[PDB]
Write a protein that binds this DNA or RNA. Structure first.
Lengths: 339, 339, 339, 339
RNA sequence: CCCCCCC
RNA sequence: CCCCCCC
RNA sequence: CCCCCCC
RNA sequence: CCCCCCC
RNA sequence: CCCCCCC
């Protein structure tokens, strides 16, 4: 059945159309040196409103890939959003859907903070501490990638995890910019990813275009590391299933587990059939996701969760254990094997 | 998963573009006999500023490979830096991005030192002690290759190791040039490698074009020896893992180590899949590096570090030991086997 | 039937008469050295109005072919437009149908830009950067030829494609003239081609008189390359049909495809019967075009479009697929053969 | 389509007219014994200005073919240049477009060098070392033919290749004339070929009139060897395509390659249709060149370039690889077959 | 009615 | 637009 | 550039 | 319905 | 996030 369902979904002669009357903003590569400034003036000043930081990160992505490539990416993502270009005025940027009041506020706040830290201090600002640093857009996109790995999770868990992991992953940027509010920027990125779902596809295309590069700075290598940490998002049950098989859990040989193993292997075969893009299904909110669910094998899922709980892997996972006896037996065996 | 991640990174139909508006300097082979002089006038005099010694070494590399081949190397490294040629003036060199004041200072300092060592002494300067010696550019590039092997490490460790190893590796050059400041030249080379990342690719191409040569002087053989000592940079955990497997450590048979051995072998298979260029991934700061990390196998890494500590190989390695009990048990077994 | 229709259209003893009371402008060869200046003063300055750039390109064509040959070309194109010669005044040109205010504005804007770029800069303007360069009329006609290849398409697609292709085809001219507005010049050329349809015949005659030349500059070779890229305009279905036959698509052997293959071969026989001038039928808007339509073979057209979609050739083609089942089957087989 | 494009270009009832008000210089055969002297006084002396050496070689060509035949050659090349004859004065030559100051400078420099090498030396100048040697014009035309083979390439590559190949091809002349500056003479010939394009036709006519001769010296045989090495200039992709077909590359059987093979064979059929003069199309800058481009078959071109790269033939070819996956696969297969 | 991609 | 290696 | 042995 | 830990 | 010793 599962192969037939995927065959129906894949073999479609008709293309969906959505967001027909909508538009979005991009910034041409000719403005990259400008957007960098903006992407850094968000980082070293303490701003009251961090509402469009995610849009500025996506603007930098658009400068990197190019306006035409970004339009093509949005078009092939199933969304008929018409790209609107970015202009300059007196210079500053007039990004579509980003209020000019916001851009002026961010610029003025950063200029005032820079003046205050230059007047009082000894005037020895290093090359990495200024807003026009060239890795500041990647530093903002690193907060974006941290909150990207938690798009399958909830908002509160995502924000808490982003802040916790960014105090260590982004320690160097925090030292360079003492006053960068990872919570508010992470909230902005979560809002962008939820509202504009095609920007998940744009962000993934940037991740690919960055990982495929021949050279990169440490900021881009960090961004790619986090982006790849997001790969199996929304499918931790499959990873824990292969973990359970590697652990040689005895309760995998139970009668009901052996009964469901056929369709479990069917799900894994479907994973292989989709191939490399299967991992990005839940990150993209591809409607095709959910063909990879193991919820139709309650006993296998309970055994997998029990094995994970025994090994300590389960952590604070919020999934359901359908069959509690199998869960407890698997947990006991996994603890025994671990000890 | 790891094979799929590498498949995504490798199978990219789009090329990255960076350093679009930037330029760099090369020196044509027709100026090699001139750059040699410069590359040696850095070595036998005591200079206040050693800021661009690395750029002069890279200039000699550009003379060796050729301007067009160097432009091609920079282009295929993912960087759209426009090569700027080198000219002469009254003769001395006007290298782009190298201030003419610096070149004049180095030349004048070397001429004054030569006059002082000729007026006072008996006038018996041998053929190897003069700045126009033909192995002086390779002697400078040897300090560069020593600091090249420490690009994955930190700056202070790199400089300390460079000086310590250069007092023995480069003893003959030090005898020939009593006043050559390995610390400042090493600092210059570290600065060049950090700022201009495409010059890592140029330096690797010189290493290949030198190792592939049919003949070479002892300086070039030394440079190739050091360059090959840099091969596995940034991946000492994989080397220590194969060391642990060769040592037949009993704690490799632990439950958790045997649990993680599958994905460990996956990392090694990915190493084989990339092939010869895998070793140069961290040296080049290829963003694709980090697919070879064993950080997702904490128990295997702890066992490997314990085995290394028992054998005395660990030295002063600064990696983390995740599971301390496995580390201590492996260290005890490794010491027992060593004794 | 199709041969009979073409026989009726071809065997006509009566000549049509149109544009009887209309006139058009030409420029004699004696003014070529003057028109060149104008054709280049459009290219290196930033003009508010680019309305008659196409007429200036056509004026240069008229200088190249000659006034009498141009009148003959207009007469044999089915249009009874009376040629009006070009005069000079105080020197500048008074082209018929081109307001003297426009010519004065273009000349003054170019002179002011030249004065600004000479006063501020170091006064080292090369021979190719000045308006009086002899390939500037061909550079303008290259934008005209780019928008010529998109006369069967729509206006927006034509302009987008012209700009995209001119950033690469005309990179050297863009470097020579940093401020040349390919969008506005392309709009002017599209307007000319739509309003004055006999100028399509003039432009084709220039393409022939240029391709037949024994020698030419790189600009003229580029113009001929683009002009020949326009050859099969308006008939991509025939090209994709021969592509499908070359691909040996199995769905070509379907019952309905084999039913329609007879009249399909009739269309191809008509193509051969018309011969070399068949390709220029849609470019010229020859009313005889439409005898080459494959719209009366819906199943063959659907199979051809499916084959193109499978091979990736279809791109973003906007034609209709009549029979969706054949389209999908052909697409599946074409993808299978491609893989 | 390609056959129709060539049919349009070939079937033209109108002849182009260019260079109407221009003139050029020829030298009658009655002055050959004089021009020989000049053509050799360029070779054994060290001249500050080598500006018109190419014009002197072309003058010798004009003496060889004859003034009337040279005028006819210029006329049938599509250029309406009026031949101006050459006169003598007190003897020396007054060549049109060649300043008499230049001729006097060359003659005086050669006479002074001859006096210096006769006064100091033992006075045993052999018959081949004097300027009046009868193969000196052919020795100059050999540098001209070396730079002729690189007219499709760039200026810097052409000059570098000319010098590199002339140190070996023209070793005997270099021994006879120690001070002959192949770089400056090659620059002069490149300038002539770029400025006066009809002189490419004259130079080709000399190549034909020399190859058709019943007897010749070793200089003329060398000139014909180089001239024939120039035959396929500007079309190395076709030669590499037939090389790939000879290599039986498996990736030629790919789906897209087999898709494009039809129009590829169309290009080759057009090559056969034009016949012997097809090779000289790019050398002559015939505007008809570009009908032979394989740029409209990106997958075939990528496979051909990959095969060449595998066999080591690609060298340092600067063409584009459109489809990188096909290029890499073809390169791998070609290396495997080579090994 | 016809046309509609890429180069 | 085209061209781009070696001999 | 080409040629290059033996009979 | 699906998802849900850690890095 | 990754890296981190010695030669």
């Amino acid at each position: 059945d599962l192969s037939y369902k995927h065959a129906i979904l894949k073999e479609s002669q008709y293309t969906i159309k959505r967001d027909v009357g909508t538009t979005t903003a991009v910034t041409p590569s000719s403005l990259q040196q400008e957007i960098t400034l903006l992407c850094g003036e968000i980082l070293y000043a303490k701003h009251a409103d961090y509402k469009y930081a995610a849009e500025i990160g996506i603007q930098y992505i658009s400068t990197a890939l190019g306006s035409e490539r970004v339009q093509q990416i949005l078009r092939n993502s199933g969304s008929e959003v018409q790209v609107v270009l970015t202009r300059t005025y007196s210079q500053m940027l007039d990004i579509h859907g980003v209020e000019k009041s916001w851009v002026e506020e961010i610029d003025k706040e950063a200029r005032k903070t820079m003046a205050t830290l230059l007047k009082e201090s000894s005037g020895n600002i290093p090359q990495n501490q200024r807003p026009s640093a060239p890795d500041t857009p990647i530093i903002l996109l690193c907060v974006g990638a941290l909150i990207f790995t938690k798009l399958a999770s909830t908002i509160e868990v995502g924000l808490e995890t982003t802040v916790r992991r960014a105090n260590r992953v982004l320690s160097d940027a925090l030292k360079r910019y003492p006053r960068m509010d990872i919570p508010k920027i992470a909230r902005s990125f979560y809002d962008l990813f939820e509202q504009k779902v095609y920007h998940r596809s744009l962000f993934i295309e940037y991740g690919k275009a960055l990982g495929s590069s021949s050279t990169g700075s440490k900021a881009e290598s960090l961004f790619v590391n986090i982006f790849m940490q997001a790969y199996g998002a929304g499918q931790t049950m499959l990873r824990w299933g292969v973990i359970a098989r590697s652990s040689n859990n005895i309760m995998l040989g139970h009668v009901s587990v052996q009964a469901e193993l056929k369709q479990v292997t069917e799900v894994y075969d479907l994973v292989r059939e989709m191939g490399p893009e299967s991992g990005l299904l839940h990150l993209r909110q591809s409607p095709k996701a959910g063909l990879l669910s193991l919820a139709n094998c309650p006993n296998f899922a309970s055994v997998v969760l029990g094995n994970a709980s025994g090994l300590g892997i389960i952590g604070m996972y919020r999934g359901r254990v359908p069959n509690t006896e199998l869960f407890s037996a698997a947990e006991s065996y996994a603890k025994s094997l671990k000890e």
